[PDB]
Amino acid sequence: AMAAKVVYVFSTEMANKAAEAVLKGQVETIVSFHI
Amino acid sequence: YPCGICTNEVNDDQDAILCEASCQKWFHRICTGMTETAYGLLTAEASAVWGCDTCMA
Ligand code: NA
Ligand code: NA
Ligand SMILES: [Zn+2]
Ligand SMILES: [Zn+2]
């Protein structure tokens, strides 16, 4: 078997921003990307 | 492992973060400027890793 995975690489800025989005109730998780 | 920012040892009882963009250096969370909450969320999410300012720039 063989698979591939996408892994998201966050800078400190984008980790902090994604946490803020979660805290503000805007997204469920830090990888809940959307339009 | 010396912290990629402060050069001091990254110990077991400190929040440690590994650059997984390229350089594979360890850093103290506090040196990076990442909040404790952001660190908790990132380290819990399997599909998310951190990259240092140098590797990301
Ligand atoms: Na993670
Ligand atoms: Na990481
Ligand atoms: Zn440090
Ligand atoms: Zn790096």
Author numbering:
A (entry chain B): 171 to 205
B (entry chain A): 341 to 397
Quoted from the paper:
Pygo and BCL9/Legless transduce the Wnt signal by promoting the transcriptional activity of β-catenin/Armadillo in normal and malignant cells. Molecularly, BCL9/Lgs proteins function as adaptors between Pygo and Armadillo/β-catenin, by binding through their homology domain 1 (HD1) to the PHD finger in the C terminus of Pygo, and through their homology domain 2 (HD2) to the Armadillo repeat domain of Armadillo/β-catenin (Kramps et al., 2002; Städeli and Basler, 2005). We show that human and Drosophila Pygo PHD fingers associate with their cognate HD1 domains from BCL9/Legless to bind specifically to the histone H3 tail methylated at lysine 4 (H3K4me). Therefore, this is a prime example of histone tail binding by a PHD finger (of Pygo) being modulated by a cofactor (BCL9/Legless).
To understand how Pygo proteins interact with BCL9, we coexpressed the PHD finger from hPygo1 with its cognate HD1 domain from human BCL9 in bacteria, and purified the resulting complex (hPHD-HD1, the “binary complex”), which was stable over gel filtration and exhibited equimolar binding. It produced diffracting crystals in several different crystallization conditions, which enabled us to determine its structure by X-ray crystallography at 1.59 Å resolution. The binary complex shows a segregation of charges on its molecular surface, with one face being predominantly negatively, and the opposite positively, charged. The former presents two conspicuous hydrophobic cavities (arrows) surrounded by acidic residues and separated by W366, similar to the histone-binding pockets seen in other PHD fingers. Two sets of contacts mediate the interaction between hPHD and HD1. The first involves primarily β sheet H bonds between PHD β5 (S387, V389, and G391) and HD1 β1 (Y178, V179, and F180). These intermolecular interactions depend mainly on backbone atoms. The second set of contacts comprises a network of hydrophobic side chains, as well as two H bonds (formed by HD1 N186 side chains and PHD backbone atoms). These side-chain contacts involve either invariant residues (T375, A378, and L382) or a semiconserved PHD residue (M374). Likewise, the HD1 residues involved in these hydrophobic interactions are either invariant (T182, A185, N186, A189, and I200) or semiconserved (V201).
